[PDB]
Design an enzyme around this catalytic site. Structure first.
Site, PDB file in Angstrom:
ATOM      1  CD  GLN A 250      29.376  47.574  -1.618  1.00 33.49           C
ATOM      2  OE1 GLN A 250      29.554  46.542  -1.559  1.00 33.49           O
ATOM      3  NE2 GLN A 250      28.069  48.254  -2.043  1.00 33.49           N
TER       4      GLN A 250
ATOM      5  CG  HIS B 268       4.630  24.890   7.849  1.00 29.91           C
ATOM      6  ND1 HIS B 268       5.358  24.550   8.673  1.00 29.91           N
ATOM      7  CD2 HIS B 268       5.476  26.289   7.064  1.00 29.91           C
ATOM      8  CE1 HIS B 268       6.224  25.892   9.435  1.00 29.91           C
ATOM      9  NE2 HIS B 268       6.243  26.819   8.220  1.00 29.91           N
TER      10      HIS B 268
ATOM     11  CG  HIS C 280      -1.489  22.878   7.119  1.00 32.73           C
ATOM     12  ND1 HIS C 280      -1.912  22.337   9.063  1.00 32.73           N
ATOM     13  CD2 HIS C 280       0.031  22.576   7.546  1.00 32.73           C
ATOM     14  CE1 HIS C 280      -0.401  21.394   8.996  1.00 32.73           C
ATOM     15  NE2 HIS C 280       0.086  22.522   8.598  1.00 32.73           N
TER      16      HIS C 280
ATOM     17  CE1 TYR D 224      26.091  45.015  -0.829  1.00 35.89           C
ATOM     18  CE2 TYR D 224      25.447  46.421   0.979  1.00 35.89           C
ATOM     19  CZ  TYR D 224      25.886  45.844  -0.541  1.00 35.89           C
ATOM     20  OH  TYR D 224      24.306  47.153  -0.943  1.00 35.89           O
TER      21      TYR D 224
END
Lengths: 150, 130
Positions: free
Chosen positions: A129, A64, A62, A125
Site C-alpha cells: 500500500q 455444478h 443438475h 496487499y
C-alpha cells in the site's frame, strides 16, 4: 458547478464459489443439444460479468459450477443472469422444455464459497500500500496481479 | 459460519477475508478510534445481515472474516462499511478530518474462505431431488 469529477474503485480479490441448481421437478432434461447449449450460454454470461468458469460439469438433473466471480457484479447477479437467460433461450429452442414445464429452473440454488487462497497474500496487499511516498511498488504490484481472461 | 444457511430458497455458506487500510496507511486505528470503528462495523453488519466471525485492527489496517448472505453481497457490505465509518469517524475525531483528505483509499482486499462441498452437494440436490 462545472466541477468535473473522477471516481476510482480498485479491488484485489480471489472469490471462488461452488454453484449448483436443478431444473424444475429435477427432470433429467440436461442432455444432448440442451446440455451443450446450456454450457454455451453460461460461458457467454460469465464473459459478460467477468466471471472465470474454472469448471462446469452437468449430470442430467443438475449443473455444478466452480468459478471465480468478480465481486463488483457479485455471485447472485451471475446466477440470476445465467438462469434467466439459459431459461429463456432454451425454452424457445426446445419445445419439450417450454410446454412440459412451467419454468426451467426453480427459485432455488446452492452456493458455497471455497478458498484456494493463503494469507501471506494479505500482508503483501498491505505492505504494498501507499503512504504519500509510494511512487514505486504500487502500480508495480497492481500490474503484477491477474485479470479475468474475457 | 461453518454450517449452511437458507434464505428465500437459496442454500449457502459465504465467508470472506476482508481488508482495507487508512490512506497512506497512517496508523490511526487505535484508542477510541479503533473501538468506535468496531461498533460502526458491527452496526453495519446488522443492517446487511452480516455475521462477523472475527475482526481485528492492527493500527494501519482492519481485517474481517465475515459470513455474508449473497442476497445483499460482500461489495455492498464493504462500500457501506467504509462509507459509514469514514463519515462517522471523521465527524467524531478532528484529527481524522483536519489532518487529511479521506479516511480510506479507493481499495479493498477480498478473499473467499471455504471447504470443498461434497456430501452437501449431493445432499442439497436430494432436498428437491426425487
Amino acid at each position: 458547478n462545472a466541477v468535473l469529477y473522477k471516481s476510482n474503485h480498485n479491488v484485489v480479490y480471489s472469490c471462488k464459489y461452488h454453484i449448483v441448481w436443478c431444473p424444475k421437478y429435477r427432470r433429467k432434461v440436461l442432455v444432448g443439444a440442451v446440455e451443450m447449449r446450456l454450457k454455451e450460454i453460461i460461458q457467454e454470461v460469465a464473459k459478460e460479468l467477468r466471471v472465470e468458469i474454472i469448471e462446469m460439469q452437468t449430470d442430467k438433473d443438475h449443473i455444478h459450477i466452480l468459478a471465480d466471480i468478480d465481486p463488483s457484479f457479485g455471485v447472485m447477479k451471475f446466477i440470476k443472469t445465467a438462469k434467466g437467460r439459459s431459461s429463456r433461450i432454451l425454452r424457445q429452442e426446445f419445445n419439450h422444455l417450454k410446454t412440459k414445464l412451467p419454468t426451467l429452473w426453480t427459485n432455488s440454488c446452492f452456493i458455497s464459497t471455497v478458498g484456494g487462497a493463503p494469507l501471506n497474500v494479505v500482508k503483501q496487499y498491505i505492505e504494498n500500500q501507499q503512504n504519500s511516498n509510494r511512487p514505486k511498488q504500487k502500480e508495480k504490484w497492481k500490474s503484477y496481479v491477474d485479470n479475468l481472461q474475457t
